[PDB]
Amino acid sequence: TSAVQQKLAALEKSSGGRLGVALIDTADNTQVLYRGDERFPMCSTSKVMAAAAVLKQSETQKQLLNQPVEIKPADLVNYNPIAEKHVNGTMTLAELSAAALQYSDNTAMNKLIAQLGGPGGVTAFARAIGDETFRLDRTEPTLNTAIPGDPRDTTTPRAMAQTLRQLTLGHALGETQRAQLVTWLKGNTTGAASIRAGLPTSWTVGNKTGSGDYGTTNDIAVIWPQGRAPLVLVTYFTQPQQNAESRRDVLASAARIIAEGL
């Protein structure tokens, strides 16, 4: 009868899907895990790894984030809220990074993938920082197919929580780059209804959402409570029916339950 872990199990049961959670409380350096070693489709939470990888490149190419990149009609895919505003024009890698992270723009993600030499270049960065679980296999939008059992484009909650920590609290990146990632995450505009909706209003949050087929609804966050050691929280959720609707409420409830236990 584990404290937080039951409640999470009951939430899962109530939802009819599969929930995965990983919290890293950087006070104790304690951890709470629910299906923490199971694989989940990452969907757009993978945008953090791709942006982080371009930042890592920027450390030796100190002019890279300002490099103009052409946005061409053929580049546009299924959800391009920022990039469609610059078709037949250019956007910089900093603007593409913010577009990908703060509006979840898929054409922006693909430009980050291209800059890293394909999906294998995103996976490469993950390995370079000790993440042996993350794998990116496809570009946008097919990486969101979220097919049950499919290992493509998956990670585990434990692995992603550990990596989000190193990227945002640790030193997988250069301080200038880490601070830049933190700033990007904090001004994310998506996921008001996800993790953020389940946390005390007083806490500062940087997060990245994802969604896909099979009602896949994901959120990953680093959380600064006031007067307290920051937290890192991963909440992944996916459902048995291809036609399933999003359940952002499940992610808020998981977060609320985690925040109770603290």
Ligand SMILES: O=C(Nc1cccc(-c2nnn[nH]2)c1)c1cc(-n2cccn2)cc(C(F)(F)F)c1
């Ligand atoms: O591309 C997609 N979704 C997307 C695009 C941009 C941002 C976000 C996002 N950001 N934050 N939360 N969601 C999500 C997407 C979605 C679906 N799908 C089918 C049913 C429900 N969904 C399928 C596919 C695929 F068939 F090609 F695989 C792609």
